[PDB]
Amino acid sequence: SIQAEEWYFGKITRRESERLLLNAENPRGTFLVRESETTKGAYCLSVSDFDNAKGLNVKHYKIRKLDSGGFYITSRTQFNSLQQLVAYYSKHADGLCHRLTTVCPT
Ligand SMILES: CC(=O)N[C@@H](Cc1ccc(OP(=O)(O)O)cc1)C(=O)N[C@H]1CCCCN(Cc2ccc(-c3ccccc3)cc2)C1=O
């Protein structure tokens, strides 16, 4: 159950995800997964980043789920579950702003 996952914040807004992530104590890769405001059946992986150009900032990645079963940000790299997706991106940055590190504090 994704609702069982501590990083799954459910039905929170994009502005709210940003408020929680834009905390000076959050290292790069601090994250949370929430429902998408705009796409039914889709989720959003919100991630904190930091660089000298932009300072502390947030990136949002749409996660799609096939009726066929797979979860993915890019269709070339799919997972059998949202949890396997989160585990993969915690080890590989690939196209993300940073690999996922720890769950966002509320
Ligand atoms: C308005 C906005 O912020 N849009 C997001 C996408 C997005 C995210 C959530 C969402 O619901 P909400 O309405 O609930 O918020 C709507 C749109 C976006 O555009 N992100 C960027 C993220 C940084 C990379 C650029 N990009 C394209 C891209 C390119 C490569 C990858 C990629 C990631 C991992 C592995 C391989 C490729 C991901 C995104 C985005 O989508």
From Swiss-Prot:
Residue ranges of every copy of the SH2 domain listed in the record: 7-104
Locations listed in the record: Cell membrane; Mitochondrion inner membrane; Nucleus; Cytoplasm, Cytoskeleton
Post-translational modifications: The phosphorylated form is termed pp60c-src. S-nitrosylation is important for activation of its kinase activity.
List of residues that carry Phosphotyrosine: Y43
Coiled-coil region(s): none
Domain of life: Eukaryota
Expression tissues: Expressed ubiquitously. Expressed in the skin (at protein level). Platelets, neurons and osteoclasts express 5-fold to 200-fold higher levels than most other tissues.
Disease linked to the protein: SRC kinase activity has been shown to be increased in several tumor tissues and tumor cell lines such as colon carcinoma cells.
Family: Belongs to the protein kinase superfamily. Tyr protein kinase family. SRC subfamily.
Miscellaneous information on this protein: May be involved in blister formation in Pemphigus vulgaris, phosphorylated-SRC is abundant at blister sites but not in normally adherent tissue, which corresponds with loss and disruption of CDH1 in cells adjacent to blisters. Phosphorylated SRC is increasingly abundant at pre-lesional sites of blister formation and occurs prior to changes in abundance of CDH1 and DSG3.
Self-association and partners: Part of a complex comprised of PTPRA, BCAR1, BCAR3 (via SH2 domain) and SRC; the formation of the complex is dependent on integrin mediated-tyrosine phosphorylation of PTPRA. Interacts with DDEF1/ASAP1; via the SH3 domain. Interacts with CCPG1. Identified in a complex containing FGFR4, NCAM1, CDH2, PLCG1, FRS2, SRC, SHC1, GAP43 and CTTN. Interacts with ERBB2, STAT1 and PNN. Interacts with DDR1, DDR2 and DAB2. Interacts with CDCP1, TGFB1I1 and TOM1L2. Interacts with the cytoplasmic domain of MUC1, phosphorylates it and increases binding of MUC1 with beta-catenin.
Domain notes: The SH2 and SH3 domains are important for the intramolecular and intermolecular interactions that regulate catalytic activity, localization, and substrate recruitment.
Job of this protein: Non-receptor protein tyrosine kinase which is activated following engagement of many different classes of cellular receptors including immune response receptors, integrins and other adhesion receptors, receptor protein tyrosine kinases, G protein-coupled receptors as well as cytokine receptors. Participates in signaling pathways that control a diverse spectrum of biological activities including gene transcription, immune response, cell adhesion, cell cycle progression, apoptosis, migration, and transformation.
Record-given protein name: Proto-oncogene tyrosine-protein kinase Src
Source species of the chain: Homo sapiens (Human)
UniProt gene name: SRC
Residues of the full protein shown: 145 to 250 of 536
